[PDB]
Amino acid sequence: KTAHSQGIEGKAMSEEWARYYPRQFDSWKKTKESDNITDMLKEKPALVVAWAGYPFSKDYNAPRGHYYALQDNINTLRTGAPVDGKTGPLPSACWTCKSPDVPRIIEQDGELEYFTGKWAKYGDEIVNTIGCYNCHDDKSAELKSKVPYLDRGLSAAGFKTFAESTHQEKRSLVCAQCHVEFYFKKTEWKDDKGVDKTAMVVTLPWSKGISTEQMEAYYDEINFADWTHGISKTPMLKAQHPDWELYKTGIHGQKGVSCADCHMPYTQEGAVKYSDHKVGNPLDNMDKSCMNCHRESEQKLKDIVKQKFERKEFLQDIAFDNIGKAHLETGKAMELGATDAELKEIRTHIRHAQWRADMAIAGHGSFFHAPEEVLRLLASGNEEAQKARIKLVKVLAKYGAIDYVAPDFETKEKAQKLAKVDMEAFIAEKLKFKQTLEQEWKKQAIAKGRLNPESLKGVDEKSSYYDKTKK
Amino acid sequence: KTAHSQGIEGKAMSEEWARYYPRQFDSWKKTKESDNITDMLKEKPALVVAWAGYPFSKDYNAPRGHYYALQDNINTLRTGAPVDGKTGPLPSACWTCKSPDVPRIIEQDGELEYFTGKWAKYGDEIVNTIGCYNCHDDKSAELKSKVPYLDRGLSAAGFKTFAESTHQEKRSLVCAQCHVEFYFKKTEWKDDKGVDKTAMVVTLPWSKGISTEQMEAYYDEINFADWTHGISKTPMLKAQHPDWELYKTGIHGQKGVSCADCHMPYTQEGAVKYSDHKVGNPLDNMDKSCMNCHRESEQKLKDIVKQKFERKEFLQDIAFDNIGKAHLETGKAMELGATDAELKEIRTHIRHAQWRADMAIAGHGSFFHAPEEVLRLLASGNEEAQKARIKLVKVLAKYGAIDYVAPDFETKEKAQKLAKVDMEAFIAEKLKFKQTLEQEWKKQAIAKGRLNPESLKGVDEKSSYYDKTKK
Ligand code: HEM
Ligand code: HEM
Ligand code: HEM
Ligand code: HEM
Ligand code: HEM
Ligand code: HEM
Ligand code: HEM
Ligand code: HEM
Ligand code: HEM
Ligand code: HEM
Ligand SMILES: O=N[O-]
Ligand SMILES: O=N[O-]
Ligand SMILES: [Ca+2]
Ligand SMILES: [Ca+2]
Ligand SMILES: [Y+2]
Ligand SMILES: [Y+2]
Ligand SMILES: [Y+2]
Ligand SMILES: [Y+2]
Ligand SMILES: [Y+2]
């Protein structure tokens, strides 16, 4: 039993845990070190055309340290510029995987209430970034999943729940609270006061299993679309970082190596063993992350991962080129008068092409976690795109445009023009929000004692649209 | 030093080595056990359309035991039905990787003479199957490459020659004498008597390196084609079992695991160590072949290889479907009057698509030896085929056939009809050859003492076109 066996007052604030676990606190805080913003839309402008009509066409960056999760959620152009608790583009579900205040609020107000209303609803309550309370019981300190949708998904897929799982399974599952593909299920409900309400509930599409194809079949069955494509009017599916799903099928996952084995390796000091809580790039700490199981140089092992990255990039660029062209050729056919009936099969191929390719690349570590499935998915997605494109030639020909050449989209600027994204307007609106309502949120939270100003040091020095210089 | 330090009389006949090395002789002879004929044209009829205009569209089977190499070379419809030493479709180079009589003849008559003339030229001389003399010096018993084209290729690619290589390298290189991609270089020469002659010389296309793309660039540079496609009139490249080339880049090859480590594992008996010379499927002997380096069940490891096979099959079937369609659509465009100039880019895409896909699948173990490169190649080949097909729609449209549907080729029979292969005629001709000239070859060789009848036991009980019942 622990030194805090009756629980921790202020448990959502990781600083409250520091008196018991100074070592783990220190290393946890060190994800502050991973502060680079890589604008993925700049790196891969094809992604802009893929996500036209959807917020990811505005702003999409690579992950950085857990230290920045909450602030990046606030900064991203995707969450827009609320003026109050009732405005802004996105729902409350956007906080879910960003903060230990989330289980705090679910515990206080119930899952359905939590999932009701705008993202802006909780701006002055959900103020701590990914912390001890997202993974640890505040009495026993044992690993716990704090979000009900994980077990719900695990059960739906015929897996053991978190509590029924082994300790080694739990050492990946704590990560799977967030590092999985999800959608928002519109959920009608009535509260205690009998008021009718609508929740947007985080749901793992795992009821047919966890492969890309089973999830595709799941979504097709319920006729679900995340958005209607801004160019092709295809009913589109967005993949989000299926990190755990793809990991599960790769060789490491099959051999029972946990996320924690590479991402949180042990240091042995006599009788005591500590987990590195600085969650980052395992290739930065190979001696600890890899070399207890592998037996040659760091440089050789790094070279082999680099080869995997290169293969993935090659197939990614092919697949997203054909997907982008397919979208543009479809929009052209629409302009010439092609009907929904003439385009139905094409749009299905596009939906599936992009679902498979997005599932392949949306988990940034998947090229390594499950290298062969990643390559297969990109090949499968590209084949679907090409099937669409062959059919599109014939539709274009019917409408007198067989020689149409889809426009280029090789820069973020060109791509965003095609996708009709007015960035400068979005940025201007965002800055006003940050300068006004965001600062009010932080002020109120500090006054209430929900937020410790110490946690904000260097947290807001970068986004895709500013760099004050270092975080 | 050995018990045969002055060399072995009758060295080409492996039975001559048995007095010194009874153990290795016994296990070597046991490849007799691997006698199954799997007709690959029946399994994958798309291959027939791919190889239309070429002998592989007639007969193409999976490998079986080394015990059958020479006889399968005789049996295959590819070598046809010579009536004498001057007839038949194929050249002397077809013996090269089938027999220890090959280095015997090269040593006696010179490389260029050996490579001059028809396959039928050596029917009564090249009569022993893959034996001790293909890999071992008959004085020292050390590993040796017995064919000059291997070092020539190794040097061309900037590798060490056989003699300059390590013992562990030699333990793969002996296999690479045969288990590599090659072509025949037409070579003009003058003999001792000053007669002008033409050799067809086995050549490894390795001067730009050993990747599929470097070899593609090699072949393109010299404008080489193995054949002109029977349907599409594309200048085609045939891949042959690039087993060593693809192995070299896979993780096992990168980690320095030799072919011999899996395919010829050691048994330790006290002070003595013996190599299993029964070269076969390592999955039949996992405890010896895998489990000195891997630490879980045989069933789990077998399951993981099976998954790799499944991924490869998936991408193979896609790629060869589009390649086959591309060939057929090209033939259709030709029928309608499309010109060589209109088809030039299309034909280039087809050539490259098939080169990449054939290189991926022609080494039957490559899905395992280099799983990720195999998937990448199939994806790359398919993309080239689809590029061709998009351009083909437009050519077809110009000629009034936009809605043309390439015919199906889902059975060997249907496929061979499209490829215009009269099997029953080829088989009838072959049987006459076997019943007449082949039996004369074996008779003469036995009379001369080049062939021991004991080696023929059960050697000729199966082909793709007969099964007397068991080999
Ligand atoms: C031990 C289990 C976990 C592992 C192995 C893991 C892995 C990672 C890695 C490697 C990164 C990128 C780090 C960097 O670039 O420096 C990251 C970022 C991120 N993780 Fe996790 N994670 C885990 C737990 C969680 C949990 C429980 C959540 C949700 C509460 C979460 C949500 C996020 C978010 C939102 C980001 C992006 C942060 C940003 O860009 O601001 N992770 N994670
Ligand atoms: C639509 C509502 C959400 C918004 C606006 C949002 C925002 C963000 C942002 C801004 C990032 C940093 C990278 C980037 O620029 O995209 C991020 C990363 C991440 N988010 Fe979300 N989030 C949402 C919903 C969720 C949910 C419900 C989960 C968990 C079930 C989640 C888990 C993660 C994880 C694991 C990462 C790091 C891995 C990666 O980005 O590839 N997010 N999110
Ligand atoms: C500063 C806040 C945190 C504190 C004080 C804390 C505390 C601890 C303690 C006392 C242990 C056991 C000793 C050790 O292995 O080092 C541990 C391990 C662990 N924690 Fe945390 N933790 C924090 C944050 C997190 C978060 C956010 C996650 C989830 C993403 C997490 C996941 C894990 C995992 C997977 C282990 C290893 C468990 C095992 O190997 O049995 N921790 N932590
Ligand atoms: C980030 C650090 C690591 C790196 C860079 C790495 C690298 C690799 C690579 C390249 C493979 C070949 C499979 C593939 O094609 O990807 C592999 C497989 C494997 N690794 Fe790791 N690995 C790491 C961590 C670990 C750890 C921590 C363990 C032990 C818990 C482990 C045990 C295994 C096992 C059992 C396999 C299956 C193949 C075999 O049985 O050897 N690895 N790894
Ligand atoms: C489901 C469990 C796991 C999760 C949630 C997870 C999380 C992640 C994430 C989010 C990334 C992308 C990092 C970024 O883009 O900044 C990543 C990359 C990576 N992960 Fe994991 N990981 C898991 C399991 C593993 C395992 C078991 C290993 C080692 C065998 C491993 C080693 C790596 C490596 C080597 C990279 C790539 C680093 C680079 O290319 O720079 N991960 N992981
Ligand atoms: C130790 C090095 C070698 C390895 C690992 C190896 C591997 C193999 C394997 C696994 C098979 C299929 C066996 C079966 O299905 O039962 C095979 C067949 C074959 N090998 Fe090798 N081999 C080696 C050396 C050679 C050499 C030196 C040559 C040329 C002289 C050669 C030529 C052939 C041929 C022609 C076949 C097909 C035989 C038939 O179908 O009748 N191999 N080899
Ligand atoms: C065009 C002349 C040749 C002919 C007619 C021929 C014939 C054959 C036959 C009938 C087989 C059994 C499998 C099948 O049915 O295809 C085979 C397999 C094989 N041959 Fe040849 N061969 C020729 C040239 C060569 C050369 C020059 C080499 C070595 C450089 C070679 C190496 C092999 C190997 C390694 C196999 C087993 C691997 C596999 O088939 O995938 N062959 N050959
Ligand atoms: C019946 C005919 C053969 C005889 C009598 C013979 C003899 C021997 C002997 C005495 C050894 C050393 C002891 C041992 O490791 O078992 C050996 C090993 C070996 N042989 Fe053979 N051999 C024959 C056929 C072949 C063939 C056709 C090949 C090539 C495809 C070959 C390749 C090898 C290899 C790779 C080794 C292991 C060398 C090492 O690990 O150092 N052998 N053989
Ligand atoms: C036919 C028997 C074998 C099987 C079925 C097998 C299976 C595997 C698999 C599935 C992998 C993961 C790489 C991949 O994605 O393919 C791997 C890698 C690896 N294997 Fe094997 N293997 C065999 C033989 C061997 C042998 C004989 C050795 C030792 C000489 C060895 C040492 C390694 C090494 C060093 C790796 C790289 C990953 C690591 O460092 O663990 N393997 N093997
Ligand atoms: C260049 C060196 C090698 C050569 C020439 C070679 C030869 C071959 C050939 C010709 C096949 C196809 C067999 C058939 O279709 O009947 C094959 C398959 C196979 N080889 Fe190799 N091999 C080499 C290296 C290795 C290594 C290093 C390993 C283990 C790490 C290995 C393990 C296997 C396995 C597991 C199969 C598949 C058996 C099956 O799927 O049924 N080979 N090999
Ligand atoms: O954008 N959060 O997956
Ligand atoms: O057909 N011998 O590669
Ligand atoms: Ca989704
Ligand atoms: Ca060739
Ligand atoms: Y406290
Ligand atoms: Y990152
Ligand atoms: Y792999
Ligand atoms: Y003798
Ligand atoms: Y076989």
Curated annotation (Swiss-Prot), chains A, B:
Catalyses which reaction(s): 6 Fe(III)-[cytochrome c] + NH4(+) + 2 H2O = 6 Fe(II)-[cytochrome c] + nitrite + 8 H(+)
One of the GO biological process terms: anaerobic electron transport chain
Cofactor(s) the record lists: Ca(2+); heme c
Cofactor comment: Binds 1 Ca(2+) ion per monomer.
InterPro entries: Cyt_c552, Cyt_c_NO2Rdtase_formate-dep, Multihaem_cyt_sf
Binding site for heme c 4: 259, 262-263, 369
Top EC class, one word: oxidoreductase
UniProt-listed Enzyme Commission number(s): 1.7.2.2
Binding annotation for heme c 5: 252, 290, 293-294
Annotated residues for binding of heme c 2: 132, 135-136, 277
Pathways involved: Nitrogen metabolism; nitrate reduction (assimilation)
Localisation per UniProt entry: Periplasm
Sites where the protein binds substrate: 182, 241
Positions that bind heme c 3: 66, 175, 178-179
GO cellular component: outer membrane-bounded periplasmic space
Tree of life domain: Bacteria
Residues binding Ca(2+), per UniProt: 181-182, 238, 240
Presence of the UniProt keyword Zinc in the record: no
Residues annotated for heme c 1 binding in this entry: 94, 97-98
Gene Ontology MF term list: calcium ion binding; heme binding; nitrite reductase (cytochrome, ammonia-forming) activity
Pfam families (alphabetical): Cytochrom_C552
Reported function: Catalyzes the reduction of nitrite to ammonia, consuming six electrons in the process. Has very low activity toward hydroxylamine, and even lower activity toward sulfite. Sulfite reductase activity is maximal at neutral pH.
Subunit field text: Homodimer. Interacts with NrfH. May form a heterotetramer with NrfH.
Family affiliation: Belongs to the cytochrome c-552 family.
PANTHER family registered for this protein in UniProt: CYTOCHROME C-552, CYTOCHROME C-552 RESPIRATORY NITRITE REDUCTASE
Protein name (record): Cytochrome c-552
Lineage, uppermost ranks: Bacteria, Pseudomonadati, Campylobacterota, Epsilonproteobacteria, Campylobacterales
Gene that this polypeptide is encoded by: nrfA
